[PDB]
Amino acid sequence: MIDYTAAGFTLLQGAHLYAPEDRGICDVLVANGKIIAVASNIPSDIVPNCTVVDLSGQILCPGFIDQHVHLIGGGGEAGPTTRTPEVALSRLTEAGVTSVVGLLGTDSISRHPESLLAKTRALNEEGISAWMLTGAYHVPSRTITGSVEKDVAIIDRVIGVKCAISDHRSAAPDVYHLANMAAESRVGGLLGGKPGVTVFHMGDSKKALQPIYDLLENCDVPISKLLPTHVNRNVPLFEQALEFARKGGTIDITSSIDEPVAPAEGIARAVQAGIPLARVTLSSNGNGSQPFFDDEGNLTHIGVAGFETLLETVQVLVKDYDFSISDALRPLTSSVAGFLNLTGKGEILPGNDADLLVMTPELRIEQVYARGKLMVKDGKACVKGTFET
Template identity: 65%
Template sequence: MNFSLLEPRLFRNAHLYDPDDRGICDLLVAGGKIVAITNANSESVPEACPVSDLNGAIVCPGFIDQHVHLIGGGGEAGPHTRTPEVRLSKLVEAGVTAVVGLLGTDGTTRHPESLLAKTRALEFEGISAWMLTGAYGLPSPTITDSVQKDVALIDKIIGVKCAISDHRSSAPDTHQLANMAAQSRVGGLLGAKAGISVFHLGNSPRLLEPLYEILRTADVPITKLLPTHVNRAQALFQAALRYASEGGYIDITTSINEPIDPASAIVMAREAQVPLARLTLSSDGNGSQPEFDRHGNLIGFGVAGFESLLETLQQLVQQHHLPLEEALLPLTRNVAEFLGLTHKGRLIPACDADFLVLEADLRIREVWARGRQMVRDGHACVKGTFE
């Protein structure tokens, strides 16, 4: 799809959250970008430009989901428990206009090369997509045999992932972790990318100690090390709040509801005076949701969806009474800033035209990705190649 050929379109009378509340505005979109934002009912309209009157509906940035198992996850109970690839329609109907794919426990039968192919496929089908190299274990599975080269040389790779403080990790030592994070950092410098390291966290009593060991032994900035799934245990969440207070980002998983649901986690972080700018939300979508007993034995599993992103936004506003402009940040601008995506997460001129049109009760009416409508009346009007 050549998005540069998309015709201009004017969206009138939008209650714009960019994500800051800008009131009623008109948006001009062309070539997949936000071209101009003006006061409502401005006189200047390009000749023969289609006009959509939104009648005061909420318009906000599309969600950036930075933790998705695009080619599936799972496998903890054998090959039949490998989850399937994600479908484009499931992403866009949940409001996701940009996504970051990664591997999970299974770095044996799933590979970064396949993940790269899926990432490119989603780009072709209409949304923006990136990926992390690596998987749970170290040394990291890569495409070029080097984390640094993967990040520096492959356009879609913006960082690396591994698992720590989890019985499914490879029990990496401090040197291995520090070297991985340093390679991602340098690769990011060489490739003009974020060069991040994302750490799956389990229930080990070690909590975030491996991250502090990296900070003590390597010169990698704390803003490049992201612990995720931090709401899966009370002690882990308290450690994560301390980490964020010290300058790090933390990622709360919206598909985890116990012991701390994601909306409550955001509220608790604010009450602990953690800067809202350091909080992000992601779905862990399409990953398996295994349940283990206290001996580490698998006793059940499910598959994470994407609807939890919107549900968390609704809960933050409707139950916890956060202003919408604040509730949007961990799904939009905060994520874009952490990932180094300067053209995402905001609705200002020169940014990509990735936006949601929401009803007053925050249900999704429309989704637009790079200026192309993907969802109409809450249902995907553009689907993946084989859907």
């Protein structure tokens, strides 16, 4: 016998496939971590040493891309005891996350981009796909090489920069600082082949999106590189976000915020307003703290976010909102890959990566493939982090 096992041939048979586009019942051929063929009825013997998988009666869709996760831990708003813990592989996979963008938040004193970068690498090495944003809430940005442009341009996992605005925990940056930072990300992105975005954590300040508007009037960074996140945190901010998207910007809704605008609600609303789903993404904020502040900017309560809200949002949208599953998936898949220009991700096409979700019809996760590898079986991780126990 001849051994063709190195190929990792895998045939995924007869699931109802959402690419996210409804492909109906379709097969998927995988080799070396890549989708090599997608079509109705694939001869299970088309290739040697092929592992056949019957997904009849099941749904197949692309793995989620969570562009907002505190991979190394976050928190700290109430002292050191509130420093959250690092993210563990199985937590991600089990929630259907095959691709992630790690970032830092409030604390950039006991939290470092070098550590975030190491964790990002560990995850890629463990089996999934991971990137990161340089910077943190603090502006000017705390980087690895000393320059935002140089970080985005030269650190392979860095794709953009993070900052915070309209929030009582910001560093009170002025327009110039913001503009420059954005411009540097923009430029380091062309050079490095990164999207070069700037992600803005939004707080509850009444100024809302103003800083983003000001910034626009003060530089030549395309509206397409700027991402306001946690837009559902408050009404008036949410409403502003809608017009921002309508002007051509993309807005990121956080799944970990149920009030005042719940995730599925925000998405449905966007759509009511005429916003194209391609301009709406959804992220978890996993492992970040969920601190609530007083009227005096006083902390009262503090929790930690998880990844389960992702899937839940989908379910709700489908289930309580009348979205088609296809539509329901976009913001976690194709919309995100689109905004971040994440190649080979977000869609089920030949040549793309074999990052797939096998779900039951009532949208429950059974299996997860990350780059062609079986990570989750029967809704449970079969592959765990080097130190998960």
